[PDB]
Amino acid sequence: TEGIDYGDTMVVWPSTGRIPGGSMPPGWGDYSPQGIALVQSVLFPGIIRRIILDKELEEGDWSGWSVSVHSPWGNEKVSAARTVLENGLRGGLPEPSRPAAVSFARLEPASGNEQKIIRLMVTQQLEQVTDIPASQLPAAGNNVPVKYRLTDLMQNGTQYMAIIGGIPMTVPVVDAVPVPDRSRPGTNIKDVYSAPVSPNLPDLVLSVGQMNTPVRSNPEIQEDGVISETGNYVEAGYTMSSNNHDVIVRFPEGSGVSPLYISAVEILDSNSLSQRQEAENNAKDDFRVKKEQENDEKTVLTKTSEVIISVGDKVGEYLGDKYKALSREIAENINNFQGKTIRSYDDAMSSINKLMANPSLKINATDKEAIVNAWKAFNAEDMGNKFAALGKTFKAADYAIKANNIREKSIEGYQTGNWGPLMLEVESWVISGMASAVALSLFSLTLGSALIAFGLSATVVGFVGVVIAGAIGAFIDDKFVDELNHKIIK
């Protein structure tokens, strides 16, 4: 499964394939008639094991997979990686809203020369990966909330196995089913269950019978191609290999067998590593780019909102409170305008033509002269620099140029009554590639933060409070330019 999890911010790397790359029927060898393949290895929690599909098919055995589940025993490396993960998590995540990882084993690349489908499996008791009682686990085929996960880490083209954690993660609950005894029909094999640890591969057989037997076979358990090394609080990977999975295997009805978390990884070969490292490198930088894009968009929209409300307040204690209410609306609309598109050129210019058509919306030559001269002294260059003496508002002073055009073009329009150069320059910004929301902010910010700073009389501050409100209005909605004419100017 995959579910609601959404890979806890991870994109899929469609796996290399599964190497294979360089007598019948099953049962004939010296094996048990029960039907299950030999019990090839023991699954102690935290200790990684190299498990082979059809380990001994040709040697005579039955089809598949079979491992033994055992209680805590021996030297495992997860508990040390968990300690570094927990400690580092007290100092915040590497990257917010993305899990944190610490390696517990390093992997030597597969030769590619293999016929067998190998799989590295790691095991953990329920409680070590989650605080939900066994007794409160979901019904199989649903994801259970987890706190730790055991998966892999592509770190510098070499594949690692790590413990992730830190954000709200989730894991699929799957179902262990009793396996039938092919030698004694009607009855099932005692204390042997099968579960879809999978993926694409046949169900793993779990022999849970002799879970507590004496194990006096050296606490190390050194696998070939699995170097056990602890290492450092890093950010987790961005791609999940298609053939890798971790699930919580839930045992039957009255089995008396507590849920096991199991992780099944695919050892990637030398050219598949490079494949995955660029998949990684690319998923990382694109996330990085989307992140700043949206954050910086959010900050110029919140500062615009605030400036549009201040304009509302200043023009408001002269033009009225019906004017203040409209500014709440334009600022509300801008503060949510993320992802939206400004209105068209022909639609906006029909709106401001409607405003400027209102005959009780006039200025005398002395007031007109004051607005023009106020724009002539405007410091376009510092309005450009604002992403520094405001906060982190826009990016790169290529904006000083745009801010100077709004200026020269607001001057015309007050001078000629032609707002075409002004409205057209704003569209230019979008067309040559600016996000509508960012183009709305710069326009609204340049107009608003110039008005709350102009040395102008109240008659004039009212006229410009109407012009710039009808102008920011027109790129958002025609509602805004009807409220002005019909309820405010009159």
XYZ file of C-alpha atoms in Angstrom:
490
model
C 0.000 0.000 0.000
C 0.786 3.728 -0.014
C -2.472 5.425 1.111
C -3.114 8.702 2.843
C 0.590 8.727 3.841
C 1.687 10.343 0.530
C 5.119 8.876 1.208
C 5.563 11.505 4.019
C 6.719 13.942 1.408
C 8.465 11.350 -0.826
C 8.170 10.991 -4.618
C 8.477 7.525 -6.242
C 11.586 6.292 -7.899
C 10.313 3.489 -10.216
C 12.820 0.799 -9.363
C 15.555 -0.448 -11.691
C 13.691 -3.778 -12.185
C 14.851 -6.572 -9.856
C 17.985 -8.460 -10.838
C 17.777 -11.337 -12.294
C 20.341 -10.285 -14.930
C 23.502 -12.497 -14.851
C 13.515 -30.196 -13.344
C 10.071 -29.571 -11.606
C 7.662 -29.657 -9.703
C 8.653 -28.006 -6.304
C 8.858 -30.291 -3.285
C 11.112 -33.132 -4.540
C 14.203 -32.323 -2.475
C 14.916 -33.353 1.078
C 12.356 -30.974 2.631
C 9.102 -31.108 4.594
C 5.785 -31.913 2.779
C 3.974 -29.184 4.695
C 4.345 -27.068 1.607
C 6.479 -24.260 2.909
C 9.932 -23.337 1.790
C 12.865 -23.830 4.256
C 13.144 -21.503 7.253
C 16.079 -19.647 5.875
C 16.836 -17.086 8.552
C 15.904 -15.601 11.956
C 14.345 -12.234 12.376
C 15.594 -10.677 15.668
C 14.419 -7.016 16.037
C 16.768 -4.411 14.777
C 19.147 -6.927 13.120
C 19.158 -6.724 9.275
C 19.059 -9.901 7.233
C 19.605 -10.825 3.665
C 16.634 -12.946 2.669
C 16.605 -14.760 -0.680
C 13.430 -15.681 -2.678
C 13.349 -19.404 -3.687
C 16.638 -19.804 -1.784
C 16.680 -23.504 -2.598
C 14.132 -24.130 -5.388
C 16.591 -25.891 -7.713
C 18.111 -27.686 -4.780
C 14.574 -29.372 -4.527
C 12.500 -27.167 -2.081
C 9.059 -25.640 -2.170
C 8.250 -22.305 -3.690
C 9.069 -19.045 -1.889
C 10.018 -17.497 1.270
C 10.229 -18.430 5.017
C 11.774 -16.637 8.014
C 11.687 -17.248 11.801
C 10.451 -14.402 14.101
C 12.403 -14.259 17.414
C 12.173 -12.190 20.625
C 14.906 -9.618 21.561
C 18.349 -11.101 21.357
C 21.803 -9.914 20.212
C 23.542 -6.744 19.167
C 21.352 -4.476 17.103
C 22.203 -0.999 15.741
C 18.772 0.727 15.608
C 18.668 1.719 19.260
C 21.848 3.799 18.769
C 20.533 5.534 15.602
C 17.267 6.218 17.456
C 19.146 7.937 20.250
C 20.779 10.318 17.722
C 17.390 10.835 16.015
C 15.599 11.676 19.324
C 18.413 13.981 20.490
C 18.599 15.807 17.144
C 14.839 16.231 17.093
C 14.997 18.409 20.179
C 16.851 20.964 17.984
C 14.226 20.972 15.219
C 13.901 19.089 11.976
C 16.611 19.507 9.199
C 13.799 20.431 6.879
C 10.389 21.300 8.317
C 7.454 19.188 7.333
C 9.805 16.456 6.309
C 11.020 13.508 8.389
C 14.495 13.313 9.952
C 16.873 10.396 9.511
C 19.847 8.714 11.081
C 21.595 5.651 9.455
C 22.123 2.327 11.278
C 23.687 0.237 8.407
C 25.570 1.092 5.198
C 25.079 -0.940 2.021
C 27.637 -2.194 -0.482
C 26.042 -2.084 -3.980
C 24.653 -5.247 -5.475
C 26.597 -6.910 -8.274
C 23.691 -6.918 -10.852
C 24.960 -10.435 -11.625
C 22.255 -12.177 -9.609
C 19.391 -14.491 -10.520
C 17.874 -14.423 -7.104
C 15.627 -11.791 -5.680
C 17.310 -10.878 -2.449
C 15.626 -8.585 0.101
C 17.054 -7.019 3.339
C 14.509 -7.314 6.097
C 14.494 -5.517 9.444
C 12.118 -6.129 12.268
C 10.716 -4.161 15.185
C 8.218 -4.898 17.992
C 4.940 -2.838 17.688
C 5.671 -0.581 20.582
C 9.167 0.364 19.301
C 7.659 2.085 16.189
C 4.309 3.254 17.579
C 2.351 4.091 20.796
C -1.012 2.668 19.588
C -1.895 -0.497 21.504
C -1.877 -3.745 19.565
C -5.435 -4.014 20.841
C -6.230 -0.669 19.124
C -4.568 -1.309 15.741
C -6.837 -0.737 12.680
C -8.407 -3.599 10.679
C -5.972 -4.790 7.986
C -5.862 -2.743 4.835
C -5.609 0.538 6.745
C -2.746 2.727 7.803
C -1.789 2.991 11.440
C -0.170 6.169 12.876
C 3.575 5.521 13.536
C 6.405 7.415 15.301
C 9.504 5.774 13.840
C 10.041 3.959 10.595
C 12.843 1.838 9.258
C 13.554 2.505 5.525
C 16.552 3.495 3.388
C 18.590 6.618 2.729
C 20.235 7.532 -0.487
C 23.267 9.476 0.761
C 25.763 10.552 -1.909
C 25.020 7.891 -4.429
C 25.668 5.149 -1.766
C 22.509 3.545 -0.237
C 22.051 3.556 3.531
C 19.485 1.980 5.890
C 18.086 4.503 8.366
C 15.498 5.270 11.034
C 13.205 8.095 10.091
C 10.935 10.096 12.325
C 9.943 13.599 13.328
C 6.761 14.308 11.322
C 3.384 12.531 11.439
C 4.045 9.313 9.577
C 1.777 6.366 8.886
C 2.291 2.598 8.012
C -0.087 -0.034 6.372
C -1.596 -2.769 8.553
C -1.502 -6.167 6.732
C -2.806 -9.564 7.660
C -1.017 -12.753 8.605
C -3.072 -15.782 7.626
C -2.435 -19.450 8.816
C -0.632 -21.577 6.229
C -2.033 -25.052 5.328
C -0.174 -28.245 5.902
C 0.073 -29.970 2.541
C 1.014 -33.256 4.350
C -1.947 -33.380 6.786
C -4.954 -31.881 4.875
C -7.740 -29.925 6.573
C -5.337 -28.832 9.334
C -3.063 -25.728 8.941
C 0.732 -25.738 9.941
C 0.976 -24.988 13.655
C 2.479 -21.590 14.476
C 3.292 -20.644 10.883
C 1.462 -17.746 9.239
C 1.942 -15.918 5.882
C 1.912 -12.139 5.377
C 2.159 -9.721 2.412
C 5.406 -8.003 3.300
C 5.696 -8.179 -0.510
C 5.723 -5.888 -2.847
C 5.154 -7.746 -6.142
C 6.851 -10.781 -4.492
C 5.002 -13.740 -2.866
C 3.796 -13.629 0.733
C 6.502 -14.103 3.384
C 6.040 -17.103 5.661
C 6.603 -16.232 9.306
C 7.440 -19.063 11.668
C 6.517 -17.614 15.039
C 6.623 -20.924 16.900
C 10.009 -20.917 18.609
C 10.177 -17.310 19.385
C 11.920 -17.690 22.758
C 14.317 -20.616 22.220
C 17.948 -20.396 23.437
C 20.081 -18.767 20.772
C 23.741 -19.382 21.499
C 25.020 -18.339 18.151
C 27.124 -15.161 18.551
C 25.447 -11.779 19.187
C 26.869 -10.134 16.074
C 25.028 -11.508 12.952
C 27.230 -9.954 10.250
C 25.556 -9.925 6.820
C 27.516 -9.638 3.608
C 27.068 -6.252 1.974
C 25.554 -4.717 5.147
C 28.114 -2.734 7.034
C 26.646 -1.750 10.454
C 27.594 1.870 11.110
C 25.701 4.554 13.093
C 25.587 8.038 11.577
C 24.503 11.575 12.021
C 21.288 13.591 12.058
C 20.411 14.244 8.479
C 17.363 15.008 6.375
C 15.470 12.005 5.022
C 15.285 10.969 1.376
C 12.968 12.340 -1.274
C 12.338 9.152 -3.370
C 10.879 5.750 -2.364
C 12.102 2.824 -4.532
C 9.024 1.049 -5.997
C 10.066 -2.361 -4.638
C 10.604 -1.297 -1.007
C 7.937 -1.650 1.731
C 7.364 -1.642 5.479
C 4.148 -2.882 7.089
C 2.753 -3.938 10.433
C 1.941 -7.575 10.255
C -1.010 -8.376 12.483
C -1.372 -12.073 13.479
C -4.706 -14.068 13.692
C -7.773 -14.110 15.854
C -6.435 -15.951 18.919
C -2.896 -16.607 17.687
C -1.459 -14.918 20.764
C 1.112 -13.333 18.488
C 1.746 -9.663 18.846
C 2.040 -7.384 15.771
C 5.329 -7.174 14.059
C 6.695 -4.236 12.102
C 8.772 -5.390 9.217
C 10.846 -3.558 6.663
C 11.855 -5.034 3.287
C 14.478 -3.243 1.203
C 16.044 -3.803 -2.215
C 19.908 -3.557 -2.345
C 20.435 -1.277 -5.471
C 23.327 -1.910 -7.920
C 26.006 0.575 -9.099
C 24.206 2.240 -11.974
C 20.854 2.158 -10.248
C 22.445 4.164 -7.363
C 23.484 7.004 -9.734
C 19.966 6.812 -11.260
C 18.419 7.241 -7.840
C 20.888 9.898 -6.724
C 19.853 12.209 -9.588
C 16.210 11.363 -8.909
C 17.045 12.474 -5.383
C 19.025 15.547 -6.314
C 16.222 16.595 -8.638
C 13.348 15.969 -6.131
C 15.306 17.985 -3.555
C 16.003 21.147 -5.630
C 12.491 21.284 -6.993
C 11.099 21.094 -3.447
C 13.562 23.809 -2.519
C 12.389 25.965 -5.366
C 8.647 25.486 -4.676
C 9.228 26.237 -1.009
C 10.824 29.693 -1.431
C 8.399 30.545 -4.249
C 5.383 30.000 -2.021
C 6.878 31.418 1.095
C 8.046 34.626 -0.600
C 4.594 34.791 -2.271
C 2.928 34.515 1.155
C 5.061 37.289 2.667
C 4.404 39.895 -0.071
C 0.717 39.111 -0.011
C 0.586 39.565 3.818
C 2.525 42.839 3.704
C 0.240 44.012 0.799
C -2.868 43.182 2.814
C -1.538 45.235 5.736
C -0.688 48.238 3.503
C -4.075 48.072 1.773
C -5.657 48.152 5.230
C -3.594 51.078 6.401
C -4.731 52.976 3.198
C -8.217 51.995 4.220
C -7.650 53.393 7.689
C -6.005 56.718 6.436
C -8.401 57.450 3.569
C -11.134 56.012 5.827
C -11.160 58.699 8.616
C -11.975 61.201 5.746
C -14.038 59.262 3.124
C -15.992 57.127 5.538
C -16.269 53.708 7.036
C -17.960 52.223 3.959
C -14.586 52.995 2.361
C -12.753 51.182 5.267
C -14.898 48.060 4.716
C -14.020 47.869 1.041
C -10.264 47.959 1.921
C -10.901 44.990 4.319
C -12.348 43.214 1.235
C -9.491 44.146 -1.175
C -6.925 43.167 1.435
C -8.909 39.920 2.177
C -8.895 39.124 -1.535
C -5.195 39.840 -1.907
C -4.311 37.922 1.244
C -5.896 34.838 -0.314
C -5.072 35.557 -3.970
C -2.301 32.918 -3.860
C -2.689 30.601 -6.783
C -5.203 32.993 -8.435
C -4.726 34.976 -11.598
C -5.226 38.782 -11.998
C -8.140 39.857 -14.216
C -7.570 40.429 -17.906
C -6.266 43.659 -19.365
C -9.546 44.244 -21.318
C -11.658 43.427 -18.173
C -9.667 45.673 -15.778
C -9.643 48.568 -18.230
C -13.376 48.282 -18.659
C -13.642 48.609 -14.863
C -11.407 51.603 -14.333
C -13.051 53.290 -17.389
C -16.310 52.884 -15.487
C -14.797 54.517 -12.400
C -13.162 57.401 -14.174
C -16.450 57.879 -16.016
C -18.172 58.886 -12.756
C -18.474 62.682 -13.224
C -18.363 63.394 -9.464
C -14.814 61.844 -9.548
C -12.855 64.988 -10.508
C -9.668 66.945 -9.434
C -8.743 70.643 -9.858
C -5.400 71.579 -11.526
C -3.827 72.500 -8.233
C -4.612 69.118 -6.646
C -3.667 67.236 -9.845
C -0.354 69.109 -9.780
C 0.230 67.993 -6.171
C -0.211 64.254 -6.981
C 1.991 64.393 -10.013
C 4.748 66.219 -8.088
C 4.411 63.698 -5.251
C 5.095 60.890 -7.689
C 8.087 62.829 -9.209
C 9.771 62.730 -5.808
C 8.904 59.092 -5.064
C 12.014 56.971 -4.558
C 11.364 54.151 -6.953
C 14.799 52.721 -6.020
C 13.957 52.169 -2.381
C 10.452 50.774 -3.158
C 12.529 48.422 -5.278
C 14.808 47.487 -2.374
C 11.774 46.559 -0.197
C 12.363 42.992 0.726
C 14.977 44.380 3.196
C 13.612 47.460 5.102
C 10.170 45.874 5.246
C 11.260 42.233 5.810
C 11.863 39.758 2.828
C 9.309 41.127 0.438
C 9.568 40.049 -3.457
C 13.284 39.076 -4.635
C 16.052 41.003 -6.734
C 16.108 44.821 -7.568
C 14.780 44.479 -11.032
C 11.752 45.769 -9.198
C 13.185 49.268 -8.905
C 12.622 49.420 -12.664
C 9.040 48.187 -12.335
C 8.357 50.538 -9.457
C 9.694 53.462 -11.574
C 7.378 52.509 -14.389
C 4.335 52.519 -12.068
C 5.486 55.980 -11.054
C 5.913 57.515 -14.547
C 2.728 55.762 -15.598
C 0.688 56.922 -12.580
C 1.915 60.446 -13.455
C 0.455 60.014 -16.946
C -3.145 59.192 -16.160
C -3.169 61.955 -13.542
C -1.702 64.157 -16.327
C -3.595 62.673 -19.307
C -6.437 60.499 -17.886
C -4.902 57.521 -19.692
C -4.460 54.638 -17.299
C -3.667 52.319 -20.205
C 0.181 52.485 -19.723
C -0.316 51.751 -16.038
C -2.651 48.779 -16.384
C -0.703 47.419 -19.319
C 2.642 47.434 -17.497
C 1.071 45.274 -14.751
C -0.105 42.738 -17.316
C 3.390 42.855 -18.896
C 4.798 41.603 -15.587
C 2.526 38.586 -15.589
C 3.012 37.807 -19.328
C 6.832 37.980 -19.171
C 6.569 35.417 -16.342
C 5.593 36.938 -12.858
C 3.147 35.086 -10.641
C -0.213 37.062 -10.612
C -0.140 37.237 -6.819
C 3.424 38.737 -6.794
C 2.377 41.180 -9.591
C -0.676 42.207 -7.559
C 1.484 42.873 -4.485
C 4.137 45.128 -6.140
C 1.373 47.142 -7.804
C -0.719 47.407 -4.694
C 2.319 48.014 -2.452
C 3.810 50.709 -4.786
C 0.414 52.497 -4.908
C -0.605 52.112 -1.233
C 2.730 52.679 0.458
C 3.256 55.733 -1.719
C -0.186 57.212 -0.606
C 0.361 56.612 3.144
C 3.643 58.523 2.646
C 2.699 61.385 0.375
C 2.651 64.908 1.669
C -0.911 65.660 0.401
C -4.073 67.405 1.661
C -7.287 65.517 2.619
C -9.121 66.317 -0.636
C -6.274 64.831 -2.568
C -5.724 61.791 -0.232
C -9.393 61.004 -0.853
C -9.057 61.207 -4.685
C -5.983 59.007 -4.695
C -7.660 56.714 -2.133
C -10.442 56.175 -4.698
C -8.069 55.891 -7.780
C -5.749 53.342 -6.254
C -8.660 51.373 -4.693
C -10.503 51.263 -8.013
C -7.144 50.333 -9.636
C -6.137 47.439 -7.319
C -9.853 46.613 -7.390
C -10.040 46.189 -11.163
C -7.402 43.387 -11.223
C -9.392 41.417 -8.664
C -13.015 42.113 -9.102
C -15.538 44.450 -10.682
C -17.492 44.336 -7.364
C -14.844 46.642 -5.902
C -15.251 49.286 -8.608
C -19.057 49.178 -8.358
C -18.890 49.772 -4.494
C -16.794 52.887 -5.107
C -19.037 54.604 -7.684
C -22.446 53.635 -6.306
C -21.906 53.869 -2.544
C -18.730 55.963 -1.957
C -18.206 58.809 -4.481
C -21.843 59.300 -5.384
